[PDB]
Design an enzyme around this catalytic site. Structure first.
Site, PDB file in Angstrom:
ATOM      1  N   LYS A 256    -115.578 -82.679 -34.973  1.00 55.93           N
ATOM      2  CA  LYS A 256    -115.240 -83.688 -35.911  1.00 55.93           C
ATOM      3  C   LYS A 256    -114.676 -84.721 -35.367  1.00 55.93           C
ATOM      4  O   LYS A 256    -113.687 -84.796 -34.743  1.00 55.93           O
ATOM      5  CB  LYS A 256    -114.439 -82.883 -37.009  1.00 55.93           C
TER       6      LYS A 256
ATOM      7  N   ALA B 139    -118.331 -89.017 -38.365  1.00 55.27           N
ATOM      8  CA  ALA B 139    -119.286 -88.091 -37.799  1.00 55.27           C
ATOM      9  C   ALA B 139    -118.828 -86.596 -37.499  1.00 55.27           C
ATOM     10  O   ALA B 139    -117.873 -86.599 -37.125  1.00 55.27           O
ATOM     11  CB  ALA B 139    -120.177 -88.534 -36.703  1.00 55.27           C
TER      12      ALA B 139
ATOM     13  N   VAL C 120    -120.448 -82.712 -35.694  1.00 59.49           N
ATOM     14  CA  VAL C 120    -121.351 -82.040 -35.060  1.00 59.49           C
ATOM     15  C   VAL C 120    -121.299 -80.411 -35.410  1.00 59.49           C
ATOM     16  O   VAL C 120    -120.388 -79.883 -34.949  1.00 59.49           O
ATOM     17  CB  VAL C 120    -121.412 -82.039 -33.342  1.00 59.49           C
ATOM     18  CG1 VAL C 120    -122.594 -81.340 -32.773  1.00 59.49           C
ATOM     19  CG2 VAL C 120    -121.428 -83.726 -33.045  1.00 59.49           C
TER      20      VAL C 120
ATOM     21  N   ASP D  96    -118.671 -97.661 -19.627  1.00 64.42           N
ATOM     22  CA  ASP D  96    -117.762 -96.979 -20.305  1.00 64.42           C
ATOM     23  C   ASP D  96    -117.775 -95.409 -19.927  1.00 64.42           C
ATOM     24  O   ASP D  96    -117.370 -94.635 -20.736  1.00 64.42           O
ATOM     25  CB  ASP D  96    -117.987 -97.239 -21.648  1.00 64.42           C
ATOM     26  CG  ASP D  96    -116.868 -96.667 -22.445  1.00 64.42           C
ATOM     27  OD1 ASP D  96    -115.468 -96.823 -22.280  1.00 64.42           O
ATOM     28  OD2 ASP D  96    -117.051 -95.881 -23.533  1.00 64.42           O
TER      29      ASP D  96
END
Lengths: 322, 318
Positions: free
Chosen positions: B21, B25, B27, B135
């Site tokens: 969490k 969003a 998952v 990144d």
């Protein structure tokens, strides 16, 4: 196998000349490199006598040895490994032990002393930076080569592989925290030992001596030592940086390299951590010679780049000096 | 309809535990009903997004559709409602590579090797599709059930995944020189850092605060452990090059000795996406068995719609 009509024994490409060190699981022989002429000192270790744990520790030590590459640490040149034996072709120091020299010829002049202590501090510092601590220094660890340069021997090499003799050398060099029962690892310990080594170089004597262990302990714990009348006040001050009872109050070697005494007569050449120079594996004068010894260029490039410690690599390194 | 107050469904997927969490969003582990296959679903509340975030979101959906590589998390299906977006993608049960390293110690060079070929291939492929991450963190490298690498969120912002947590240690030195911080060279440096972790089980540059980190990254020096092969050491010297211009290119690095040891006739080479086989009768017959028309299958598969037919077909591939 037999090599030459009526000559001395050989192992690999090395003529075995004479045993120059015996004892325990190991012999040491002086040898000559057939291909090259150089003399070497060959460690001979009986694998037979060793258990699998020892065997594994030994090999990792040999791996450490490979990594050590400093003008004052004995260098490894080649490993020859048979079924029953392990042969470590080491750099040879004919000079003997430093402390022995000191007994024979008296103290060194501070100039002479400084030159050697610089090398010792450089060598031991290089080892610390690589996280290799010895914590067991004895006279037998510091050698001289034919050119009176310091070669540090068996640093990071455990005692099993050098018999009932294990405690002869250590106490005069051991740090007070051993006799106190506080922890006895860390470079701090080696630093203590180096201060002692300094003392022997300039006084020709042990700062802490004793007829027995009781007496040695008493003095070491108390940390007091003659300042002989000839000892320059800068040397006295250097000693204060090494021989401090409390291990965390001792100077690190990195700091100590900046000291006034260590750098005297070296205005523009302050001693610093040693930076290992990249090994040149492309010297073509050397490669041509080896081609002449019947080695292929293909095979040379391979042993060299791989950095395997076989006869090809050895020959190159020995071609040399080194 | 409902499943019974038992786990809810969305489309052809039944929703098991929540596995992550974040803000924006979630998952969820999920099972694809028709097929049994395990999937990860990313659930994004569109509701709370400003136009800009919405656009960033859709770009990330574009990018998933382009990228198809055995080591990059694949997209299978999309379900969209006026207010919620679900992306159905590969589940990576193994967690983060770095975590696995911390838990179980360093990998042996043979093991680190085979993971690293996977990683190098995948990043080169993205560079080949002109997608550059800039990144790289630990959370970008995941492991699947079979211990295979699955790179996640490569080419994305992190808006839809606390953000500057893992990236400094993998940041390229130019980051601290006020220069330009773009170009594949940055990813290449990070890749050097990842090698280090695989074979050592720790980081080459670290610090208790930013300054300390910077000083060590800028100096660019790092410990070579006793156990580390000189080949591995040499390969590292090709990634961790302070000058961005003198850093090795991936395409050249693929030919390294270390990279190819035990692969004499099977040298690493840039990835080549094959054309998707949309004609597997074995699968199609199975699908017709589930009630799909023969031609709605071709409709979906050619166009490549990431609908229920497409998802079903790919999922049947594994």
């Amino acid at each position: 196998g037999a090599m030459g009509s009526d000559e001395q024994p050989h192992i690999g490409n090395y003529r075995l000349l004479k045993t120059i060190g015996k004892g325990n699981f190991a012999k040491v022989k002086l040898a000559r490199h057939i291909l090259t002429g150089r003399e070497v000192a060959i460690k001979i270790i009986d694998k037979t006598q060793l258990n699998p744990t020892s065997l594994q520790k030994l090999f990792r030590e040999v791996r450490i040895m490979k990594i050590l590459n400093h003008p004052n640490i004995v260098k490894l040149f080649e490993v020859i490994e048979t079924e029953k034996t392990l042969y470590l072709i080491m750099e040879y120091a004919s000079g003997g032990e430093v402390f022995d020299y000191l007994v024979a010829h008296g103290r060194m002049k501070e100039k002479e002393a400084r030159s050697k202590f610089r090398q010792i501090v450089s060598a031991v510092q290089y080892c610390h930076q690589k996280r290799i601590v010895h914590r067991d220094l004895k006279a037998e660890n510091l050698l001289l080569d034919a050119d009176m340069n310091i070669k540090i021997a068996d640093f990071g090499f455990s005692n099993e592989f050098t018999k009932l003799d294990t405690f002869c050398g250590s106490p005069p060099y051991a740090a007070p925290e051993l006799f106190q029962g506080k922890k006895y690892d860390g470079p701090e310990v080696d630093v203590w030992s180096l201060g002692v080594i300094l003392y022997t170089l300039v006084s020709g004597s042990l700062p802490f001596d004793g007829q027995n262990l009781k007496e040695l302990r008493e003095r070491v714990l108390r940390g007091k030592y003659r300042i002989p009348f000839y000892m320059s006040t800068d040397c006295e001050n250097l000693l204060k940086r090494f021989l401090v009872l409390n291990p965390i109050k001792r100077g690190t070697l990195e700091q100590i390299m900046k000291d006034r005494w260590i750098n005297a007569g070296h205005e523009e050449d302050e001693l610093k951590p040693f930076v290992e120079p990249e090994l040149d594996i492309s010297d073509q004068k050397r490669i041509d010679i080896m081609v002449g010894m019947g080695y292929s260029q293909e095979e040379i490039q391979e042993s060299l780049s791989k950095m395997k410690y076989d006869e090809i690599t050895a020959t190159y390194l020995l071609l040399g000096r080194k």
